[PDB]
Symmetry: C3
Subunit: 261 residues, 3 copies
Amino acid sequence: NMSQQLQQIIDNAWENRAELSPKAASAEIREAVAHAIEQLDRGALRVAEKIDGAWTVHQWLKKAVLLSFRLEDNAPMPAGGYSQFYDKVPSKFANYTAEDFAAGGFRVVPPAIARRGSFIAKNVVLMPSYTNIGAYVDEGTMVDTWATVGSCAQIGKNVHLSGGVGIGGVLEPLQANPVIIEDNCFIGARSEVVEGVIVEENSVISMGVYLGQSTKIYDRETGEVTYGRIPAGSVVVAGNLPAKDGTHSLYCAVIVKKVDA
Amino acid sequence: SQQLQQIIDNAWENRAELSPKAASAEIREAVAHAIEQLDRGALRVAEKIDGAWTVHQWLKKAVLLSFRLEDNAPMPAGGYSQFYDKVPSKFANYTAEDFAAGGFRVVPPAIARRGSFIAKNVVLMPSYTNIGAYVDEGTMVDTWATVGSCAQIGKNVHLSGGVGIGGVLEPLQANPVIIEDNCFIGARSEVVEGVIVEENSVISMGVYLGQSTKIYDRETGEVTYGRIPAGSVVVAGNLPAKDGTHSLYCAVIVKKVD
Amino acid sequence: SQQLQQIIDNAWENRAELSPKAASAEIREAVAHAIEQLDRGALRVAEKIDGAWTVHQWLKKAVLLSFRLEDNAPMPAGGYSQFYDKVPSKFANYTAEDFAAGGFRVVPPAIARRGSFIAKNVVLMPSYTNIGAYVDEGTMVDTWATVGSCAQIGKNVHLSGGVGIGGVLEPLQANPVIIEDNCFIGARSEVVEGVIVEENSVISMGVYLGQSTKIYDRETGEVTYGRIPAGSVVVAGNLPAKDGTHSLYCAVIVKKV
């Protein structure tokens, strides 16, 4: 019922969001939004999860994230002299103590950063990389150099996001599922998964594979073209499909093998 | 301005005699003012004059001189590391009032070099904006994108994650990369070597455009180079070798919109 | 040095007994010295001996032991954020004179880990150089490029924007990624998993080379893996499936010197 009372406040604040700004918002609303962000940051709540067998989005948590923007002004952020930043979302690690880091059980390799309101699980290694607000990065996952975990993305356990991999954010539309990378997936260097595509568990995605909602996924075995989902245990490489007229071909992803756990 | 170009153009001719230890007060002030003007967007390395994109070579000269006139120095960062360069951050001396007046956001650890212009309502996710670049109003520069030296980025452009816009500081005469108003550039794409993407274009993911990239127009069968016409929808493709043994990467214009 | 390798090889066999709180002074000194020598370029993880690239497994062991011997600790950054890791920056303790003597540039926010060598006349645009890497004279590392663990980058190499050079710290016997002298690697390309790019090669944009990537030689029709021959010009392509329904990504050598 704690979460129920919390959602009630957030949902009403959202409907009445035109009343809210950094100078004007009730203590109840500010406290609710801050608590929602804190719970997302700790992984006690998560923007999407399995409900009754199916990935489901909690729209109210996306609303909380969006309200957290509305309620804060940008301010200068100090960095020891060489430069400054200017934003309204604090670093997840701004107020961490040595004890907080020890308890977290992950590594933050400089200059990696994550925004406040993302969860980083035990045994995660963040190479220099970016984790946006609302993201959930589960245990044992490797986020390699110049990778991005976009807003609200759900990254499973023991996932390997290779160098320069982009996982797209999906804070809006509110109803849309975020990008979901299930447990034990390998995503090869320079690949991209955006626009709510789901990569199911035990999949192996090679280098330079770009998966959005309009990317044709060609199953070599069956000849079927699908969109938006990599089935569990798929091995996926970059390819092309020929134009009927034989003059050119267009980029696609190809499922070249299917394996078990 | 003409007085400024006059001083820079003559300093360029005599640049062999310029160093961090030797340079007239007039030349140092002119170059410094040219950099300040680029930074504020009062001058720009290229602009559209009488309907045609035109380079101001003297402003490239100003940028190159600014390197010649300064030594590298350690740059502090609060302990974890240091840097060592001769070009300051655009934001080195910014006050809270400066950031407020600028009207853009700099999401940590994003940075821009001094002598680049960032317009109001721009959002810099962690990304890099090099010297001489111009990033116009409402543009979103996403995570690990790069706005290269002298690049001209239009209004309401979306540079998606990992997008590289190449620099063209040299050759002096060469147009920089130009992305016109309202363009979408999809994740992990690249536009380099003075390619122009005209307004209202939509470039998908993994599209790599340089001076030698074949641009195949699906409707007409024509191959062109160096320019994406206004309102083009562009995707990654391949063109077949005549002998049928393989195919080579190209960009394909699949639709034209407006 | 030989005495260094003996100490390190033995420490490696006993690595289960080593920790940030348990390790002899001899072992700590030996590992620290190995890291210092890698950092200075006096030692290197792989080198060309008699025309043949050869890995020194003991230097990889030294790098791995260096992790085992140190705890993660918070790393300060002037307020906006903090980091938490056990490998220091190469530049953590650099003086103005150290930077002067090194002869390279570190454009903010570029970073390199302690135990990597950066030669003179190198320019590091914002980029990452991991431990064990060797970046030789005159090389340009462009914005958001990565030089991975143990990578050997030759002289006068241009790693363009967003280029990833993969690391190969393990397996111990495996050659790291090697980019030989005077190579150009175009934007957003990737070289991983011990692929070697031989000298004077030109790799275009969006070329992704790993151990499974087919390298198609246009002139001969031959497919090979793991090696770009000296002077090759390489572009992204595809090879057609026999059944004509699709094609699959490959690299194509379109010209030689």
